[PDB]
A paper describes a structure:
The histone variant CENP-A is the epigenetic determinant for the centromere, where it is interspersed with canonical H3 to form a specialized chromatin structure that nucleates the kinetochore. As one of two pillars for kinetochore assembly at the centromere, CENP-N recognizes the CENP-A nucleosome through its amino-terminal region, while forming a heterodimer with CENP-L through its carboxy-terminal region to recruit other CCAN proteins. Here we demonstrate that the human CENP-A-interacting protein CENP-N promotes the stacking of CENP-A-containing mononucleosomes and nucleosomal arrays through a previously undefined interaction between the α6 helix of CENP-N with the DNA of a neighboring nucleosome. Overall, our data suggest that CENP-N, as one of the key proteins of the inner kinetochore, stabilizes, organizes, and compacts centromeric chromatin in a way that depends on its specific interaction with CENP-A nucleosomes and on its DNA-directed interactions with a neighboring nucleosome.
In the cryo-EM images, we consistently observed that ~30% of CENP-A nucleosomes form ordered stacks on the grid in the presence of CENP-N, ranging from 2–10 nucleosomes. By focusing single-particle analysis on nucleosome pairs contained in these stacks, defined density for CENP-N was observed between two nucleosomes in the two-dimensional (2D) class averages for nucleosomes reconstituted on either DNA fragment. Superposition of 3D maps showed the exact same nucleosome stacks in cryo-EM datasets of CENP-N with CENP-A nucleosomes reconstituted onto the two DNA sequences, suggesting that the DNA-sequence context does not affect nucleosome stacking. Our structures reveal a previously unidentified interface between CENP-N and nucleosomal DNA, consisting of a series of positively charged amino acids (K102, K105, K109, K110, R114, and K117) that are all located on the same face of the α6 helix of CENP-N, on the opposite side of the main CENP-A decoding interface on CENP-N. These side chains allow α6 to dock onto super helical location (SHL) 4–5 of the second nucleosome in the stack. Consistent with the electrostatic nature of this interface, nucleosome-stack formation is strongly affected by ionic strength. When the salt concentration is elevated to 200 mM, CENP-N is still able to interact with the CENP-A nucleosome, but no stack formation is observed. Point mutation of individual side chains (K102A or R114A) resulted in reduced levels of nucleosome stacking. Other metrics for the inter-nucleosomal interactions, including the relative rise, shift, and tilt, exhibited similar trends, suggesting that a singular CENP-N is sufficient to stably maintain stacking between two CENP-A nucleosomes. Collectively, our data show that CENP-N mediates the stacking of mononucleosomes by engaging simultaneously with two CENP-A nucleosomes.
Numbering used by the authors:
A (entry chain A): 46 to 134
B (entry chain E): 45 to 135
C (entry chain B): 23 to 101
D (entry chain F): 24 to 101
E (entry chain D), F (entry chain H): 33 to 124
G (entry chain C): 14 to 112
H (entry chain G): 15 to 114
Amino acid sequence: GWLKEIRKLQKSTHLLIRKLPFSRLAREICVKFTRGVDFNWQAQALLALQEAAEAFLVHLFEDAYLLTLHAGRVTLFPKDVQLARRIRG
Amino acid sequence: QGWLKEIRKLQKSTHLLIRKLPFSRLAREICVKFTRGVDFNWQAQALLALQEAAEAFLVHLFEDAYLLTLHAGRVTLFPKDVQLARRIRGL
Amino acid sequence: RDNIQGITKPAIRRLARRGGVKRISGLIYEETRGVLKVFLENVIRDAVTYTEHAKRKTVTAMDVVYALKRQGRTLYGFG
Amino acid sequence: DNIQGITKPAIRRLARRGGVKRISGLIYEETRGVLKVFLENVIRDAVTYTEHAKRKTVTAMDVVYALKRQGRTLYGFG
Amino acid sequence: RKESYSVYVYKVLKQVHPDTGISSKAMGIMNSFVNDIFERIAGEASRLAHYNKRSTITSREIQTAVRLLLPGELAKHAVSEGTKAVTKYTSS
Amino acid sequence: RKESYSVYVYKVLKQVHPDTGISSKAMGIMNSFVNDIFERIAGEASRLAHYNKRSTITSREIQTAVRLLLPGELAKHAVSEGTKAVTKYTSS
Amino acid sequence: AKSRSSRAGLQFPVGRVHRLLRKGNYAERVGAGAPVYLAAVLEYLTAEILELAGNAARDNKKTRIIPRHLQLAIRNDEELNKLLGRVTIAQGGVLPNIQ
Amino acid sequence: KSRSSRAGLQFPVGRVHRLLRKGNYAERVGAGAPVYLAAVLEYLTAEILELAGNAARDNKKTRIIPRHLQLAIRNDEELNKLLGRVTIAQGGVLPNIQAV
DNA sequence: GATGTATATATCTGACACGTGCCTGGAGACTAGGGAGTAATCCCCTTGGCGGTTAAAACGCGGGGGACAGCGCGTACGTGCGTTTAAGCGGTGCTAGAGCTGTCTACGACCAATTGAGCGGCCTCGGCACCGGATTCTC
DNA sequence: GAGAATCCGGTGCCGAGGCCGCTCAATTGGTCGTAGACAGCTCTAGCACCGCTTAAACGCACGTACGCGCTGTCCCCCGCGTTTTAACCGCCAAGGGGATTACTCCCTAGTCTCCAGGCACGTGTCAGATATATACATC
């Protein structure tokens, strides 16, 4: 079932989060930390944010899934993600 | 009981939990194997410095690795826990 | 109007399949939407500072590369 | 020997400081193992500084600088 | 002949506390504290003299280095105190 | 007017490989590789000009920085290759 | 005939920081207003951590600061724990932390 | 007569010496250092690109793409410890599958 | 055994390896002055050892405490499938914004005299560490 | 409902803070080159939007694969008491080399001058991308 889905996604390299929702999220979060000022992201830097966010989330879910196989689970509960951040610090 | 008193006692004082001369002989044995032939002088404060770093590192490692035994429902550590705790960080 | 639900219910599933997780639970969809948000603050607040210093309203790629290098997670591919 | 100086009650007190309630038995090997694979990466990263300034004596500042470069910053002993 | 920062920490401690003594070992910790933060900030602000292709270190670069190297509320109090020091330094 | 390290990586690739092409994006990675290692070593050896209270950077400090910044076998090959370059540089 | 810290209204020195910031080779040109600001920042940081340490010192019915008090004053406060994360204070010990 | 060709290198020597003068690293820069530095950088570049080219050859493609550098870094042991805190754009991951 | 699973080629599509012009940063030359490498020295910090004690570690033992294996109920999750909504292409406009080229000025290196702020050595005495004693707490 | 945990007091002891001598490094002051703030102009590349269109998400119905609590079993760390042992304290000798000073010398830095190399620009053309179609691998 899922096994044809993993081995297709660990082969390709393209982005998974779509570009426009991530751009709207970045323009939302950026305007709170600059005292209500807009900015103008270059069209290259949003790719850098998105690549760092994808790499961080993929490494995070790999470590969380390494935690899930320890306790006999296969399912990835929210107890698992909030514990793989306090260990890493 | 007993352990409930020992955790309260050892977390209060700030001593050295490892004896001096075995740790010093271990550090000298490791230092001999690199760039052989010559000996190496150690100042008496440097071995204390390295001992404080090693004790703080091992205490932080056990306190970090213990949280993967309450998570599995167990009470007791295992070498799987310590090796997984080093696997998470990247050391 | 949702503003964080642009991260969808299966985009988290695609990231978990890339990570190699067989079966996601439920409230993960409400958890990851927290964590990502926190991480973006510790880039963007760290990246809006450098572009504030050089009198530029444009947030270039080099600024995000420098902020990610300062956080510890070095990024290479852009510049 | 020269490794069995780190005895069983030594590692036991190192664990009881960390909040560990109940300890297994095989830990007393792996911890010694990881102790060695710590100290090596502090020793040679120290002694290169000792081989740079051409003296036969490892000062305390050399070990502080090796731990500085390693990641775990140490205070006090400077 | 080998200087340190013991006297100044002792003066600050006698300022913000009436008679609280400090041992000769813990004072050493304070040396390795404040020979360290000065290594970060006045190191890292030097990096901001290189990305913008400059050659000076003015107060503005140290201000941005304090905005980076400290968490939120402590950074806000520090940047509020530093310019308060500078303004009464300028009108000497 | 804004230099890079593309031509030299291309020459090394055509040296150790006959016709293996390299894309214009991955070459960019090589730029951010070797504008990075040079930031470490020639940064960190500068620190060894400060602990020993010196003011120069000779070959010996770069040699010790390579002994520090690299793992074992790669560091041994690098220190064996660098002095081999220096000795045929000296007798010019 | 007149001190730099006395114009600064501070307690940490100014000429020593300026001397280190020239001799450290951080930049080839040092602005004049910089080390006063930097010394004020260092004074506020040391004042904050000693102000947090002295309360725990009087909490243990003591008047002489030992490193355990600095360990507790670092680890109990949130923002200093964010700052001094990867630092092992010598002779320090750990927090009382059970279960 | 150039200092690159005099030492038998491929990386430049004058540019590295220019970046060590204007880099604020020490007050004086010797002459025996930057040739050593360029030699070490050339060895590391060849070390990466050999594995990258072999992994590109085994995928039956005559062009180097960042997935190939990702595979060559994460399959090598030494560069796993040298580059252990590095994300790579257009990267991907290793083919990691594990069961219970 | 139909559903993947690998391969032939279609062509088409654009990146890219390459060729040229060209501006400027790297090489040749050489003086000069501080950095330092070598030589000597003397003390000072470390190493080695005698010896005696005393906490501290090693070892049997048994007993409860916990880990592990099976198992039943069930519920929260994957999947199939129609819809409907939002994301991408791509095209236009089109203007704020990087940047970069002069200028002139405040400003910081650079340097001679000079003196007190801070560093080294010393000497208590109160703070504190330890040892012994009197007042609570759960099984 | 009494051995164990907490607070209290007394006494030695030893380092923390006050004090003096002093010296060298920070201050003051006058000089000059220049780094950078400041203004204005010019190309460019990012944002807003819109029409389409269509790929994917959304919502739901349902079957069922794990989550979890329970329980039985068996093994396995911890507390305890005895024996053994090496860590430590204090001393005493001695000596290897760490820190300091002198002195010459040499090697890198600055400035000038000359031109070969590395960068921006432009262009045919092969590498692959995706797409369709067809020969193997399999629960």
